[PDB]
Amino acid sequence: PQETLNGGITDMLTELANFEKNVSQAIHKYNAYRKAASVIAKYPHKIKSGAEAKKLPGVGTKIAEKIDEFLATGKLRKLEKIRQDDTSSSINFLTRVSGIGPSAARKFVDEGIKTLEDLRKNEDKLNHHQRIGLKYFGDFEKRIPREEMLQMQDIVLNEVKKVDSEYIATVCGSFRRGAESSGDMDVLLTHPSFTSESQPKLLHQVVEQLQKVHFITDTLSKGETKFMGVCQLPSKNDEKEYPHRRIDIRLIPKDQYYCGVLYFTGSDIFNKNMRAHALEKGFTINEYTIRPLGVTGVAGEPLPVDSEKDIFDYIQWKYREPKDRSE
DNA sequence: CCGACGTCGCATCAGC
DNA sequence: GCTGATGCGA
DNA sequence: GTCGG
Numbered sequence: 295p296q297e298t299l300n301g302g303i304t305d306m307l308t309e310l311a312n313f314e315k316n317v318s319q320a321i322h323k324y325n326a327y328r329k330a331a332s333v334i335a336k337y338p339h340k341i342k343s344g345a346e347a348k349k350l351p352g353v354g355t356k357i358a359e360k361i362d363e364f365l366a367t368g369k370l371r372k373l374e375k376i377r378q379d380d381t382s383s384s385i386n387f388l389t390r391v392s393g394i395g396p397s398a399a400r401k402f403v404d405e406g407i408k409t410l411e412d413l414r415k416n417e418d419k420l421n422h423h424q425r426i427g428l429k430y431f432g433d434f435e436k437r438i439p440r441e442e443m444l445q446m447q448d449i450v451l452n453e454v455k456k457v458d459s460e461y462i463a464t465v466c467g468s469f470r471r472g473a474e475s476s477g478d479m480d481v482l483l484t485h486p487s488f489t490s491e492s493q494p495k496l497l498h499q500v501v502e503q504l505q506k507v508h509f510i511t512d513t514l515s516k517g518e519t520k521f522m523g524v525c526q527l528p529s530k531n532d533e534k535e536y537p538h539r540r541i542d543i544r545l546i547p548k549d550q551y552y553c554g555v556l557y558f559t560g561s562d563i564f565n566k567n568m569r570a571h572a573l574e575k576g577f578t579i580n581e582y583t584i585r586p587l588g589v590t591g592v593a594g595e596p597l598p599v600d601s602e603k604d605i606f607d608y609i610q611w612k613y614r615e616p617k618d619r620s621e
Numbered sequence: 622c623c624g625a626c627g628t629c630g631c632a633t634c635a636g637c
Numbered sequence: 638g639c640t641g642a643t644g645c646g647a
Numbered sequence: 648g649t650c651g652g
């Protein structure tokens with residue numbers, strides 16, 4: 295519905311979620327809060343009491359309490375106090391740097407490193423990923439208009455075909471779902487000489503080429519099948535530089551192409567829903583295969599997949615275009 | 622009461 | 638030197 | 648923190 299129906303409640307739960315993940319390092323409380331925030335966000339009525347909220351799956355006793363305090367006072371004592379806490383709030387903030395998780399963040403704050411300015415003063419203490427996360431902190435939190443996404447796609451598809459015309463490159467993620475803007479670019483890569491059964495540097499060659507034409511600018515991580523890095527559109531004339539963008543490139547077995555594209559097209563919430571209904575119907579799905587579950591619930595051999603629809607067919611669900619996979 | 626809470630690739634750390 | 642464990646992001 | 652064995 296509309297995000298101001300219970301926006302105060304869901305903002306509260308989301309904030310609680312972050313402090314559980316980043317500060318308390320309690321990942322399951324983090325997910326519990328977000329699960330509750332999500333079900334309340336869909337609730338098409340303005341919540342009048344914690345008890346009313348408790349009817350929803352994922353909303354229990356403790357969250358019911360907190361909603362009652364929020365409704366009555368417009369705030370949470372615990373949340374106000376945690377905000378005022380220098381240590382906790384510093385740890386929470388530092389995890390916004392890509393590469394800095396709850397563990398590294400706590401470690402930094404322990405030795406007095408609390409801000410971005412503290413981080414820049416201490417490059418020695420940052421690993422490769424974290425330095426780049428720091429370097430492009432502002433850029434990485436910017437969103438990408440679809441127009442720039444299309445220019446980025448133009449370059450990717452072009453340079454990929456130049457290396458080898460038998461490559462297949464597919465931009466997935468929110469882009470494939472037709473989103474008007476994206477958080478990054480996700481690229482799936484496929485080549486005839488790489489299948490599940492069976493050239494040594496297939497992913498490397500593409501990365502190398504995208505670097506040569508100055509599209510890819512930084513490397514966060516790179517292995518045989520997964521590239522995580524930074525890219526940037528070229529500027530014209532003197533007209534000022536574009537923001538640096540996050541880009542992932544994945545090389546998948548050609549015979550497992552459709553499971554891969556389904557998986558990395560998402561959305562995340564769509565995938566977990568599809569996986570739940572897959573278990574409901576006695577199947578299991580990952581980024582590679584769909585496999586039947588025997589009577590005792592053990593996965594069998596990968597099924598033949600020749601399209602995305604085939605995966606939908608197996609679990610008795612009406613085919614849905616990428617644009618309808620919001621959830 | 623108390624165990625489950627997706628899974629995966631890469632970077633880095635712990636320890637032989 | 639290596640294997641196994643853990644952090645991290647998606 | 649929530650759910651359910």
Ligand SMILES: Nc1nc2c(ncn2[C@H]2C[C@H](O)[C@@H](COP(=O)(O)NP(=O)(O)OP(=O)(O)O)O2)c(=O)[nH]1
Pocket residue numbers: 466467468469473475476477478479480557558559560561562565628647
């Ligand atoms: N295994 C796994 N896959 C995920 C997860 N989250 C997302 N994905 C799988 C499915 C995600 O949809 C997807 C591609 O990753 P993104 O770029 O991170 N997400 P998207 O492109 O939809 O949003 P954005 O516009 O902000 O970039 O990969 C996750 O938590 N776990």
Ligand SMILES: [Mn+2]
Pocket residue numbers: 467468476477478479480
């Ligand atoms: Mn994406």
Ligand SMILES: [Mn+2]
Pocket residue numbers: 467478479480542647
């Ligand atoms: Mn991504």
Ligand code: NA
Pocket residue numbers: 347348349350351352353354
């Ligand atoms: Na409930």
Ligand code: NA
Pocket residue numbers: 388389390391392393394395
């Ligand atoms: Na981070």
